[PDB]
Design a protein around this ligand. Structure first.
Ligand SMILES: OC[C@H]1O[C@@H](O[C@H]2[C@H](O)[C@@H](O)[C@@H](O)O[C@@H]2CO)[C@H](O)[C@@H](O)[C@H]1O
Length: 147
């Protein structure tokens, strides 16, 4: 892996040091605290807060009740149509590895070595230059594999 970041402070907002071309991997290892309600990994067009940076891919594990993962896109401060995955591999008090693979028409995400979901591009992946991680999560490392 390339351009590795260790033990970042959350919230983390960092520049992605190269293009997200097809085959590019974003690898995030961490653990979920016992009191987690939710956390999110956001692939963003910049880091503006006013107006809020568009979020090409919002990947949002939620932990209340049975749990789920919500995915969405934010364009001009409006959320689009949510895509919900009910078969969530995340658990409070457990470590994880998220691998996001960028493909031509979509993202593919695997967690703990098992395929989890797909998310079709709504914003051109060329516009993504920023990785945001927010919420109740502890991140051990972030790494990239650029194609
Ligand atoms: O879609 C991603 C965003 O969801 C927002 O919450 C939604 C909620 O998921 C939905 O069920 C409904 O109640 O509308 C809410 C407001 O749009 C979160 O606030 C936001 O952080 C994103 O996760």
């Amino acid at each position: 892996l390339q351009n590795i970041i260790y033990n970042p402070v959350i919230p983390f907002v960092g520049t992605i040091p190269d293009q997200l071309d097809p085959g590019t991997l974003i690898v995030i290892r961490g653990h979920v605290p016992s009191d987690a309600d939710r956390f999110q990994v956001d692939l963003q067009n910049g880091s503006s807060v006013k107006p809020r940076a568009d979020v090409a891919f919002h990947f949002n594990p939620r932990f209340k009740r049975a749990g789920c993962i919500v995915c969405n896109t934010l364009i001009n401060e409006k959320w689009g149509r949510e895509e919900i995955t009910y078969d969530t591999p995340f658990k409070r008090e457990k470590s994880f590895e998220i691998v996001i693979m960028v493909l031509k028409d979509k993202f593919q995400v695997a967690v703990n070595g098992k395929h989890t979901l797909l998310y079709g591009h709504r914003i051109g992946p060329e516009k993504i230059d920023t990785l945001g991680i927010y919420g109740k999560v502890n991140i051990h490392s972030i790494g990239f594999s650029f194609s």
